[PDB]
Amino acid sequence: DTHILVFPFPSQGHINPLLQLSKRLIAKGIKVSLVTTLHVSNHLQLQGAYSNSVKIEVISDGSEDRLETDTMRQTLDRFRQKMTKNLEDFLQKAMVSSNPPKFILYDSTMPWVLEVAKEFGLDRAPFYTQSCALNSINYHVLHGQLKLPPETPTISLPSMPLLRPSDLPAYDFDPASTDTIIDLLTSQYSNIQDANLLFCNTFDKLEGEIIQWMETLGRPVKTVGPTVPSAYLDKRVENDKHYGLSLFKPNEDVCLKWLDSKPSGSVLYVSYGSLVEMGEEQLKELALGIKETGKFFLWVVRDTEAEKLPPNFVESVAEKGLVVSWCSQLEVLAHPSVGCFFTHCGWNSTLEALCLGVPVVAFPQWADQVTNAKFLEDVWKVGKRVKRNEQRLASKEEVRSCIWEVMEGERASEFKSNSMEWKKWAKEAVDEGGSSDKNIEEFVAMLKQT
């Protein structure tokens, strides 16, 4: 039996994609051990009950954890030194055991894993959990064809759409972290020469040209996405309705009953992200913009954010708006009453919109979200970006008009038509003989050749 290690970066947004790939691998008979920290194993129940369940390997004592006093460098230098020793310690034992691991698949955000694999003579592959488009951008920043301040008003990278400065990741919301973030991002492409493969959380129909460009860098590139549960795609992995490894523990939901009573394709599902902190002025323009559409909306917004809503807002939308602390985004997006998705354009939510065939109103906030929004609007053509002002503030009218344009406007039919197509192609890719299934089959066969 073939054994591999999967080593995600310990942050929500990064763990899910690897857990999901780990499920496709165990479904093809690979034994998977998940290498992770004391902190992640305490807050997630990763241990399934079965013979083929992912084995959880805690390799840290918690002393590598982020302190709230830390400057980003401090958090990263410490994480690296301690986790480097932890992995080395783990491999010193694992590699001389009964059936040692034949591979380590690690989040591309931890390129120092490659150096450890190299010392132990262990086959290794980084996993790029965000768009291939952002692999092009960061590679070009690394090799100098692109600067941290864009040197021109239009950027034409090879095999890419034209990008403006406002289409490029904005990592500068904390002008103290920006350089640290960019060096960490650009450092994921420096040591690829020694990578067995480069895994990408995308699919060939979505980013084909960019993936073909990446293949020119000299290593085999395997598209294995989207990492969305099987029950919403090919449905070949029994019970796969959630991101996690252990048996799904349903919350008590009010959202689906509410959606059941609204017309087919009628309601705007609103989520500007579980991690985004939105200022009160923008929050109010967003709220009144949604209200000024007169459409049914379901808005999921956590209590610390909900606190910042205009005092009488929730009461004023008693008829049309359901504003709640939690729903299952996957179950909401899959619901026939949901016609449009107002999103922050995080890669994970972007893949879910594409997979579940829901047109978007793109309200990107930080980082790769701006580039994800550019592709959703101009490349995949499944909706529109809220126009924002010089101040970056999106007015209530620009929120209202954008929602109306996507849901009711001239290109409304086109957005839905294109979303149904991307839903088909996404399912195709992960279904038997799909571009992604074939990359996973190929990988599994290679592993079996030890």
Short mmCIF file of C-alpha atoms in Angstrom, two decimals:
data_model
loop_
_atom_site.label_atom_id
_atom_site.label_comp_id
_atom_site.label_asym_id
_atom_site.label_seq_id
_atom_site.Cartn_x
_atom_site.Cartn_y
_atom_site.Cartn_z
CA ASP A 1 0.00 0.00 0.00
CA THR A 2 1.38 3.46 -1.01
CA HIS A 3 1.79 6.02 1.85
CA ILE A 4 2.16 9.83 1.31
CA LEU A 5 2.38 12.93 3.55
CA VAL A 6 0.11 15.99 2.95
CA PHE A 7 1.33 19.12 4.84
CA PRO A 8 -1.10 22.09 4.56
CA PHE A 9 -0.28 25.59 5.77
CA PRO A 10 -2.17 25.93 9.14
CA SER A 11 -4.66 28.67 8.12
CA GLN A 12 -8.35 28.38 7.20
CA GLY A 13 -8.51 28.85 3.42
CA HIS A 14 -5.39 26.68 2.95
CA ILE A 15 -6.36 23.52 4.90
CA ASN A 16 -9.63 22.75 3.01
CA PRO A 17 -8.09 22.41 -0.51
CA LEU A 18 -5.53 19.81 0.71
CA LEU A 19 -8.16 17.89 2.80
CA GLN A 20 -10.33 17.74 -0.40
CA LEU A 21 -7.43 16.49 -2.63
CA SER A 22 -6.59 13.97 0.21
CA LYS A 23 -10.16 12.58 -0.19
CA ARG A 24 -9.73 12.03 -4.00
CA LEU A 25 -6.41 10.23 -3.23
CA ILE A 26 -7.80 7.85 -0.51
CA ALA A 27 -10.76 7.13 -2.91
CA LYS A 28 -8.06 5.82 -5.37
CA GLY A 29 -6.39 3.70 -2.63
CA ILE A 30 -3.51 6.01 -1.47
CA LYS A 31 -2.88 5.96 2.34
CA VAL A 32 -2.61 9.67 3.41
CA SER A 33 -1.02 11.06 6.62
CA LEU A 34 -1.88 14.76 7.33
CA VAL A 35 1.16 16.52 8.92
CA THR A 36 -0.16 19.36 11.15
CA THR A 37 0.16 21.45 14.32
CA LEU A 38 -1.28 20.98 17.86
CA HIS A 39 -3.50 24.07 17.21
CA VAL A 40 -5.18 22.72 14.00
CA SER A 41 -5.88 19.22 15.57
CA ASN A 42 -7.52 20.98 18.62
CA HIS A 43 -9.98 23.12 16.53
CA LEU A 44 -10.77 20.62 13.69
CA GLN A 45 -11.77 16.90 14.08
CA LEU A 46 -9.69 15.47 11.18
CA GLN A 47 -9.86 11.74 12.21
CA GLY A 48 -12.40 9.61 10.28
CA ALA A 49 -13.37 6.22 11.79
CA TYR A 50 -12.26 3.97 8.91
CA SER A 51 -9.31 1.87 7.69
CA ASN A 52 -8.66 4.32 4.76
CA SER A 53 -9.21 7.54 6.76
CA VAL A 54 -6.48 10.21 6.62
CA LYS A 55 -4.06 9.55 9.53
CA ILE A 56 -3.50 12.74 11.60
CA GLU A 57 0.18 13.35 12.46
CA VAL A 58 0.69 16.21 14.97
CA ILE A 59 4.39 17.20 14.67
CA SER A 60 4.34 20.47 16.75
CA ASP A 61 4.00 21.28 20.52
CA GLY A 62 2.29 24.68 19.91
CA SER A 63 5.41 26.81 20.61
CA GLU A 64 5.48 27.80 16.91
CA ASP A 65 2.01 29.51 17.21
CA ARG A 66 1.40 33.15 16.20
CA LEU A 67 1.58 35.70 19.08
CA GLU A 68 -0.65 38.85 18.78
CA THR A 69 2.46 41.06 19.52
CA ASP A 70 4.24 39.73 16.41
CA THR A 71 5.53 41.52 13.29
CA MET A 72 4.72 39.17 10.29
CA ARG A 73 8.44 38.34 9.79
CA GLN A 74 8.64 37.15 13.45
CA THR A 75 5.62 34.88 13.01
CA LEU A 76 7.10 33.42 9.76
CA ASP A 77 10.77 33.08 10.80
CA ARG A 78 9.69 31.25 14.00
CA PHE A 79 7.07 28.99 12.24
CA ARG A 80 9.80 27.98 9.67
CA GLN A 81 12.70 27.23 12.14
CA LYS A 82 10.43 25.20 14.52
CA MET A 83 8.40 23.41 11.77
CA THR A 84 11.69 22.66 9.83
CA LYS A 85 13.03 20.89 12.95
CA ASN A 86 9.61 19.27 13.59
CA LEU A 87 9.38 17.83 10.05
CA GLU A 88 13.05 16.64 10.18
CA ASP A 89 12.33 14.90 13.56
CA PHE A 90 9.13 13.36 12.04
CA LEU A 91 10.96 12.13 8.87
CA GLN A 92 13.95 10.79 10.94
CA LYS A 93 11.39 8.30 12.42
CA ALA A 94 8.89 7.93 9.50
CA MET A 95 11.62 7.23 6.84
CA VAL A 96 13.13 4.25 8.83
CA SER A 97 9.66 2.77 9.77
CA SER A 98 7.68 -0.30 8.45
CA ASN A 99 6.17 1.44 5.34
CA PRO A 100 7.85 4.88 5.02
CA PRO A 101 6.10 7.65 3.02
CA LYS A 102 6.84 7.73 -0.77
CA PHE A 103 5.92 11.45 -1.16
CA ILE A 104 5.31 14.80 0.60
CA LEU A 105 2.70 17.14 -0.96
CA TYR A 106 2.98 20.54 0.86
CA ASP A 107 1.28 23.97 0.55
CA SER A 108 3.43 26.03 -1.91
CA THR A 109 3.47 28.71 0.92
CA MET A 110 6.09 26.46 2.72
CA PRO A 111 8.76 26.06 -0.01
CA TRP A 112 11.35 25.23 2.75
CA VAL A 113 9.61 21.78 2.90
CA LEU A 114 11.36 20.99 -0.48
CA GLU A 115 14.85 21.47 1.12
CA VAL A 116 13.90 18.93 3.89
CA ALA A 117 12.50 16.44 1.27
CA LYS A 118 15.79 16.97 -0.71
CA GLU A 119 17.94 16.07 2.39
CA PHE A 120 15.84 12.87 3.01
CA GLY A 121 15.67 11.91 -0.73
CA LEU A 122 11.83 12.09 -0.55
CA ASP A 123 9.78 12.93 -3.70
CA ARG A 124 7.93 16.26 -3.15
CA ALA A 125 5.47 18.64 -4.89
CA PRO A 126 4.20 22.10 -3.85
CA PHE A 127 0.38 22.62 -3.97
CA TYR A 128 -0.64 26.11 -5.24
CA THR A 129 -4.10 26.42 -3.60
CA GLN A 130 -5.02 29.75 -5.38
CA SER A 131 -5.52 30.54 -9.13
CA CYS A 132 -2.85 29.69 -11.75
CA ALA A 133 -3.31 33.35 -12.89
CA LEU A 134 -1.67 34.35 -9.53
CA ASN A 135 1.22 31.89 -10.20
CA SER A 136 1.95 33.99 -13.35
CA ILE A 137 1.73 37.29 -11.39
CA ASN A 138 4.00 36.17 -8.49
CA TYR A 139 6.51 34.49 -10.86
CA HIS A 140 6.78 37.74 -12.83
CA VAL A 141 7.24 39.76 -9.62
CA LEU A 142 9.94 37.28 -8.54
CA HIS A 143 11.88 37.47 -11.84
CA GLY A 144 11.49 41.27 -12.24
CA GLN A 145 9.10 41.49 -15.22
CA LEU A 146 6.51 42.99 -12.77
CA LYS A 147 7.23 45.38 -9.81
CA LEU A 148 5.44 45.80 -6.41
CA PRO A 149 4.41 49.26 -7.71
CA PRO A 150 3.31 48.53 -11.33
CA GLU A 151 5.76 50.38 -13.69
CA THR A 152 3.03 50.91 -16.43
CA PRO A 153 -0.73 51.53 -16.85
CA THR A 154 -1.37 48.16 -18.60
CA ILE A 155 0.38 44.85 -17.82
CA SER A 156 0.63 42.28 -20.62
CA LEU A 157 2.09 39.05 -19.20
CA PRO A 158 2.59 36.00 -21.43
CA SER A 159 -0.60 33.94 -22.05
CA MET A 160 -2.57 36.28 -19.67
CA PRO A 161 -5.39 38.81 -20.16
CA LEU A 162 -4.39 42.52 -20.07
CA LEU A 163 -4.35 43.63 -16.38
CA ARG A 164 -4.56 47.19 -14.92
CA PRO A 165 -2.95 48.12 -11.56
CA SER A 166 -6.43 47.62 -9.95
CA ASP A 167 -6.51 43.96 -11.25
CA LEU A 168 -3.22 43.16 -9.40
CA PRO A 169 -3.19 41.83 -5.80
CA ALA A 170 -3.27 44.72 -3.23
CA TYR A 171 -1.29 43.25 -0.24
CA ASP A 172 -0.93 46.72 1.39
CA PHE A 173 -4.03 46.94 3.71
CA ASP A 174 -1.34 46.60 6.45
CA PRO A 175 1.48 48.77 4.97
CA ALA A 176 3.81 47.05 7.55
CA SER A 177 3.14 43.45 6.26
CA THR A 178 3.20 44.27 2.48
CA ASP A 179 6.92 43.49 1.72
CA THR A 180 6.87 40.39 4.05
CA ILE A 181 3.72 39.12 2.19
CA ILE A 182 5.29 39.74 -1.30
CA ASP A 183 8.67 38.05 -0.40
CA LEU A 184 6.70 35.01 1.00
CA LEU A 185 4.56 34.96 -2.20
CA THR A 186 7.53 35.28 -4.59
CA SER A 187 9.54 32.64 -2.59
CA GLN A 188 7.02 29.89 -3.60
CA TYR A 189 8.56 29.88 -7.17
CA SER A 190 12.33 29.95 -6.38
CA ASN A 191 13.05 26.21 -5.83
CA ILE A 192 10.54 24.60 -8.31
CA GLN A 193 13.52 23.12 -10.24
CA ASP A 194 13.63 20.34 -7.62
CA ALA A 195 9.83 19.79 -7.46
CA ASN A 196 8.67 16.35 -8.74
CA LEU A 197 5.40 18.05 -9.87
CA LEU A 198 3.55 21.34 -9.35
CA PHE A 199 -0.08 20.82 -8.21
CA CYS A 200 -2.65 23.56 -9.00
CA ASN A 201 -6.12 24.12 -7.45
CA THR A 202 -7.69 24.87 -10.88
CA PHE A 203 -8.92 22.98 -14.01
CA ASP A 204 -7.69 23.09 -17.64
CA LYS A 205 -10.91 24.61 -19.13
CA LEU A 206 -10.73 27.51 -16.59
CA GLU A 207 -7.02 28.59 -16.92
CA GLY A 208 -5.68 26.36 -19.76
CA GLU A 209 -3.40 28.93 -21.48
CA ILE A 210 -1.85 30.05 -18.14
CA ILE A 211 -1.25 26.37 -17.06
CA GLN A 212 0.43 25.73 -20.48
CA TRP A 213 2.69 28.78 -19.84
CA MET A 214 3.53 27.38 -16.34
CA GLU A 215 4.50 23.99 -17.92
CA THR A 216 7.26 25.96 -19.85
CA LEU A 217 9.10 26.66 -16.49
CA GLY A 218 10.38 23.07 -16.84
CA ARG A 219 8.39 20.92 -14.32
CA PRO A 220 5.19 18.88 -14.88
CA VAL A 221 2.10 20.92 -13.73
CA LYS A 222 -0.96 18.89 -12.53
CA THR A 223 -4.33 20.72 -12.38
CA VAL A 224 -6.37 18.80 -9.73
CA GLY A 225 -9.14 21.36 -8.93
CA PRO A 226 -11.64 22.54 -8.13
CA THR A 227 -11.24 21.25 -4.52
CA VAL A 228 -15.05 21.46 -3.88
CA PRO A 229 -16.77 18.44 -2.25
CA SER A 230 -17.77 15.60 -4.69
CA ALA A 231 -21.52 15.81 -3.78
CA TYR A 232 -21.69 19.20 -5.66
CA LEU A 233 -19.63 17.94 -8.70
CA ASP A 234 -19.17 14.30 -9.95
CA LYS A 235 -20.70 12.71 -6.77
CA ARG A 236 -18.30 9.70 -7.02
CA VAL A 237 -17.13 10.12 -3.37
CA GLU A 238 -20.02 8.88 -1.16
CA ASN A 239 -21.17 11.39 1.57
CA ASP A 240 -18.71 14.13 0.36
CA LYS A 241 -20.97 17.13 1.09
CA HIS A 242 -18.48 18.96 3.37
CA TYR A 243 -14.78 20.09 3.31
CA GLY A 244 -13.70 18.01 6.38
CA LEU A 245 -12.55 14.38 6.93
CA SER A 246 -14.77 13.36 9.94
CA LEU A 247 -18.59 12.76 9.78
CA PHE A 248 -20.51 16.05 9.11
CA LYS A 249 -22.14 17.49 12.30
CA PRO A 250 -25.04 19.63 10.98
CA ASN A 251 -25.78 23.02 12.63
CA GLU A 252 -29.49 23.98 13.06
CA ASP A 253 -30.23 26.00 9.86
CA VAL A 254 -33.01 28.60 9.22
CA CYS A 255 -31.60 29.60 5.76
CA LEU A 256 -32.85 26.67 3.56
CA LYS A 257 -36.51 26.78 4.83
CA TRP A 258 -36.50 30.58 4.07
CA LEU A 259 -35.03 29.91 0.55
CA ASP A 260 -37.65 27.10 -0.04
CA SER A 261 -40.48 29.74 -0.11
CA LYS A 262 -38.79 32.17 -2.61
CA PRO A 263 -39.18 31.87 -6.41
CA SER A 264 -36.56 29.84 -8.39
CA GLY A 265 -33.41 31.92 -9.10
CA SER A 266 -34.83 34.98 -7.25
CA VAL A 267 -32.59 35.62 -4.19
CA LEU A 268 -29.19 37.38 -3.90
CA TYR A 269 -26.88 35.40 -1.55
CA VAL A 270 -24.56 37.96 0.15
CA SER A 271 -21.17 37.11 1.78
CA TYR A 272 -18.17 39.53 1.74
CA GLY A 273 -16.06 36.82 3.47
CA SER A 274 -15.60 35.20 6.94
CA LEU A 275 -12.22 37.06 7.42
CA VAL A 276 -12.95 40.50 5.81
CA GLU A 277 -13.46 43.36 8.34
CA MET A 278 -15.56 46.06 6.56
CA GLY A 279 -15.72 49.71 7.78
CA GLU A 280 -19.13 51.14 8.78
CA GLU A 281 -19.38 53.64 5.89
CA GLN A 282 -18.83 50.95 3.19
CA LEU A 283 -21.03 48.52 5.19
CA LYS A 284 -23.92 51.07 5.12
CA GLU A 285 -23.56 51.77 1.38
CA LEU A 286 -23.58 47.97 0.81
CA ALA A 287 -26.70 47.46 3.01
CA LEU A 288 -28.77 50.32 1.41
CA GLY A 289 -27.59 49.25 -2.09
CA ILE A 290 -28.89 45.67 -1.46
CA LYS A 291 -32.14 47.16 0.04
CA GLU A 292 -32.58 49.58 -2.92
CA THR A 293 -32.75 46.54 -5.35
CA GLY A 294 -36.09 45.38 -3.75
CA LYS A 295 -34.89 41.77 -4.33
CA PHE A 296 -34.96 38.87 -1.81
CA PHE A 297 -31.50 38.55 -0.19
CA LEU A 298 -29.87 36.14 2.29
CA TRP A 299 -26.85 37.88 3.97
CA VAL A 300 -24.44 35.74 6.14
CA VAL A 301 -22.35 38.13 8.33
CA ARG A 302 -20.59 37.16 11.64
CA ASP A 303 -21.61 38.96 14.87
CA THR A 304 -18.54 41.33 15.11
CA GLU A 305 -19.33 42.55 11.52
CA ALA A 306 -23.16 42.60 12.03
CA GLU A 307 -22.46 44.98 15.00
CA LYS A 308 -21.43 47.64 12.40
CA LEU A 309 -24.70 47.50 10.36
CA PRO A 310 -26.83 50.71 10.25
CA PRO A 311 -29.01 50.72 13.44
CA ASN A 312 -32.44 50.22 11.78
CA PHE A 313 -31.17 48.27 8.72
CA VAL A 314 -32.17 44.65 9.64
CA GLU A 315 -35.67 45.78 10.80
CA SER A 316 -36.20 47.86 7.59
CA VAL A 317 -35.66 44.70 5.40
CA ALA A 318 -37.98 42.41 7.46
CA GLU A 319 -39.86 41.38 4.25
CA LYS A 320 -37.03 40.94 1.69
CA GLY A 321 -33.79 40.39 3.69
CA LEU A 322 -32.70 37.45 5.89
CA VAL A 323 -29.56 38.69 7.76
CA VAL A 324 -28.13 35.75 9.85
CA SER A 325 -24.84 34.82 11.65
CA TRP A 326 -24.36 31.47 9.77
CA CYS A 327 -25.52 29.22 6.89
CA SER A 328 -23.79 26.42 4.86
CA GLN A 329 -22.49 28.49 1.87
CA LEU A 330 -22.37 25.26 -0.24
CA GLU A 331 -26.04 24.42 0.65
CA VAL A 332 -27.12 28.09 0.06
CA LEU A 333 -25.27 28.35 -3.33
CA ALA A 334 -26.71 24.92 -4.44
CA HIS A 335 -30.31 26.07 -3.61
CA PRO A 336 -32.49 26.65 -6.72
CA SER A 337 -33.95 29.92 -5.21
CA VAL A 338 -30.41 31.51 -5.26
CA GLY A 339 -29.88 33.39 -8.58
CA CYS A 340 -26.81 35.55 -7.79
CA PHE A 341 -23.79 35.54 -5.39
CA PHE A 342 -22.47 38.87 -4.01
CA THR A 343 -18.95 37.78 -3.03
CA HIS A 344 -15.49 39.05 -1.92
CA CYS A 345 -13.98 36.78 -4.69
CA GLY A 346 -11.78 34.65 -2.45
CA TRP A 347 -10.46 31.72 -4.52
CA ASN A 348 -12.47 29.15 -2.50
CA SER A 349 -15.79 31.13 -2.94
CA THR A 350 -14.87 31.78 -6.66
CA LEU A 351 -14.50 28.00 -7.25
CA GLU A 352 -17.83 27.38 -5.37
CA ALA A 353 -19.67 30.01 -7.55
CA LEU A 354 -18.25 28.36 -10.73
CA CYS A 355 -18.96 24.77 -9.47
CA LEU A 356 -22.57 25.56 -8.38
CA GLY A 357 -23.30 27.69 -11.49
CA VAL A 358 -24.26 30.96 -9.74
CA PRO A 359 -23.59 34.32 -11.47
CA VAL A 360 -21.63 36.84 -9.29
CA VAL A 361 -21.54 40.43 -8.14
CA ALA A 362 -17.77 40.69 -7.45
CA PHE A 363 -16.84 42.93 -4.48
CA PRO A 364 -13.14 42.02 -4.06
CA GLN A 365 -11.47 43.44 -0.87
CA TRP A 366 -7.78 42.29 -0.51
CA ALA A 367 -4.97 40.24 -2.04
CA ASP A 368 -5.79 37.82 -4.93
CA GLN A 369 -9.53 38.75 -4.74
CA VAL A 370 -8.99 41.68 -7.21
CA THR A 371 -7.41 39.25 -9.79
CA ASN A 372 -10.16 36.60 -9.17
CA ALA A 373 -12.79 39.38 -9.79
CA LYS A 374 -11.04 40.40 -13.09
CA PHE A 375 -11.34 36.75 -14.37
CA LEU A 376 -15.00 36.34 -13.16
CA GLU A 377 -16.02 39.57 -15.01
CA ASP A 378 -13.78 39.74 -18.15
CA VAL A 379 -12.55 36.13 -18.80
CA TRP A 380 -15.17 33.58 -17.51
CA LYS A 381 -17.91 36.26 -17.91
CA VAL A 382 -20.25 35.09 -15.05
CA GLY A 383 -20.97 38.63 -13.67
CA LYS A 384 -19.60 42.13 -12.88
CA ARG A 385 -17.40 44.08 -10.40
CA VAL A 386 -19.07 46.85 -8.35
CA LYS A 387 -17.53 50.06 -9.70
CA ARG A 388 -15.70 51.79 -6.85
CA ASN A 389 -14.70 55.45 -6.47
CA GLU A 390 -11.25 57.10 -6.16
CA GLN A 391 -11.65 56.80 -2.31
CA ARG A 392 -12.30 52.95 -2.86
CA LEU A 393 -15.84 53.48 -1.51
CA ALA A 394 -18.59 51.75 -3.48
CA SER A 395 -21.75 53.90 -3.28
CA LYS A 396 -25.24 52.47 -2.71
CA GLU A 397 -26.16 53.28 -6.37
CA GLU A 398 -23.05 51.43 -7.73
CA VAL A 399 -23.99 48.41 -5.50
CA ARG A 400 -27.67 48.57 -6.64
CA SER A 401 -26.87 49.07 -10.40
CA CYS A 402 -24.27 46.22 -10.41
CA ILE A 403 -26.79 43.78 -8.77
CA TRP A 404 -29.50 44.94 -11.25
CA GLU A 405 -27.07 44.60 -14.27
CA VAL A 406 -26.05 41.00 -13.27
CA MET A 407 -29.58 39.80 -12.30
CA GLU A 408 -31.88 41.83 -14.68
CA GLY A 409 -29.68 43.71 -17.23
CA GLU A 410 -28.86 43.13 -20.94
CA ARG A 411 -26.13 40.51 -20.12
CA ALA A 412 -28.20 38.69 -17.37
CA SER A 413 -29.07 35.68 -19.65
CA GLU A 414 -25.36 35.60 -20.75
CA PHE A 415 -24.09 35.49 -17.10
CA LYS A 416 -26.51 32.54 -16.30
CA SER A 417 -25.71 30.75 -19.61
CA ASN A 418 -21.93 31.07 -18.87
CA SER A 419 -22.40 29.97 -15.18
CA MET A 420 -24.31 26.81 -16.33
CA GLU A 421 -21.39 26.08 -18.77
CA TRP A 422 -18.65 26.56 -16.05
CA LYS A 423 -20.77 24.29 -13.73
CA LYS A 424 -20.75 21.56 -16.47
CA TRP A 425 -16.97 21.92 -17.19
CA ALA A 426 -16.07 21.96 -13.43
CA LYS A 427 -18.01 18.64 -12.94
CA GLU A 428 -16.46 17.25 -16.19
CA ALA A 429 -12.91 18.01 -14.89
CA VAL A 430 -13.25 16.00 -11.60
CA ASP A 431 -15.61 13.28 -13.05
CA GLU A 432 -14.11 9.99 -14.42
CA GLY A 433 -11.74 10.75 -17.36
CA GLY A 434 -11.88 14.53 -16.63
CA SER A 435 -8.68 16.65 -17.00
CA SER A 436 -8.39 16.78 -13.16
CA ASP A 437 -9.36 13.12 -12.57
CA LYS A 438 -6.68 12.14 -15.17
CA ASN A 439 -3.96 14.19 -13.34
CA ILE A 440 -5.00 12.44 -10.05
CA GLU A 441 -5.08 8.96 -11.75
CA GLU A 442 -1.58 9.65 -13.30
CA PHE A 443 -0.18 10.78 -9.89
CA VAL A 444 -1.62 7.68 -8.11
CA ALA A 445 -0.08 5.31 -10.76
CA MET A 446 3.33 7.12 -10.41
CA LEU A 447 3.09 6.68 -6.59
CA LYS A 448 2.26 2.93 -7.03
CA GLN A 449 5.55 2.58 -9.07
CA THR A 450 6.95 3.70 -5.66
#
